[PDB]
Design a protein around this nucleic acid. Structure first.
Lengths: 50, 75, 53, 74
DNA sequence: CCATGTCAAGTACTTTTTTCC
DNA sequence: TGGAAAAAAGTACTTGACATGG
């Protein structure tokens, strides 16, 4: 039940993309957003699953 | 070629194949295409299937064995 | 995506991508009926699979 | 000579080959080069490829089989 | 602690090779 | 020649020991 963007980010952060876990910094650069936003999204997606 | 300089791992070969190659001073697809089909079958643990596989995957990308190259390598 | 059904599963398990909770090797193994060791071995393999695609 | 006295392991042979040799009271390259190509093929589990390998790796270092040596061994 | 993760080998089954008739 | 059948390489999984940070 996660949006395209939400899922992406966790695969990013968790390395589920290229085996490498990515700092907020890098993922932010990818979607063109601030590290803050990423985290906020990550966490939101995490809450969505529990 | 641009694909000639790439590492052999870009071939996603099987373990057997891979191991034989790393055991054979073969790192770059360029080093590889220069080796004749026969010169390979000599290499230990490399049999028909491995050989066969390799030909197929080189073919799947335009390449074949025993190719004659010049100006080799680039470092 | 070149990862088997199992391989993928495990990383979502382990990374919590399932229920937001990251699972120890113990639990996932218990789930698949295997030893923690095996799980790790599979994880790392699937990890290596994505560094070299 | 200096490379004749070395252990056969310096040849970095395959396991198969290796095992055959240790199964054959062959420890030193000197012992080896004295064995005829034919005398080898008889040895169990040693076949074309194994034989072949060995010839090539002996050649890669100046050596061939069936060599007639003197003052051998100790 | 002490639970989880990591390492080094170790057993046991499948696939490929390699001998050899 | 070609094919059964030994031996080796590989692949799945276990085990017990260790470290280590949580």
């Amino acid at each position: 039940k996660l949006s395209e963007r939400e899922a992406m980010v966790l695969k990013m952060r968790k390395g589920l993309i290229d085996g490498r876990e990515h700092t907020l910094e890098e993922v932010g650069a990818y979607f063109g957003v601030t590290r803050e936003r990423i985290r906020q999204i990550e966490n939101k997606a995490l809450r969505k699953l529990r | 070629d641009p694909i000639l300089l790439r590492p052999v791992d870009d071939l996603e070969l099987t373990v057997r194949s891979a191991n034989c190659l790393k055991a054979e001073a073969i790192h770059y697809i360029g080093d590889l295409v220069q080796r004749t089909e026969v010169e390979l079958l000599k290499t230990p643990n490399l049999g028909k299937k491995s050989l066969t596989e390799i030909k197929d995957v080189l073919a799947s990308r335009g390449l074949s064995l025993g190719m004659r190259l010049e100006n080799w390598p680039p470092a």
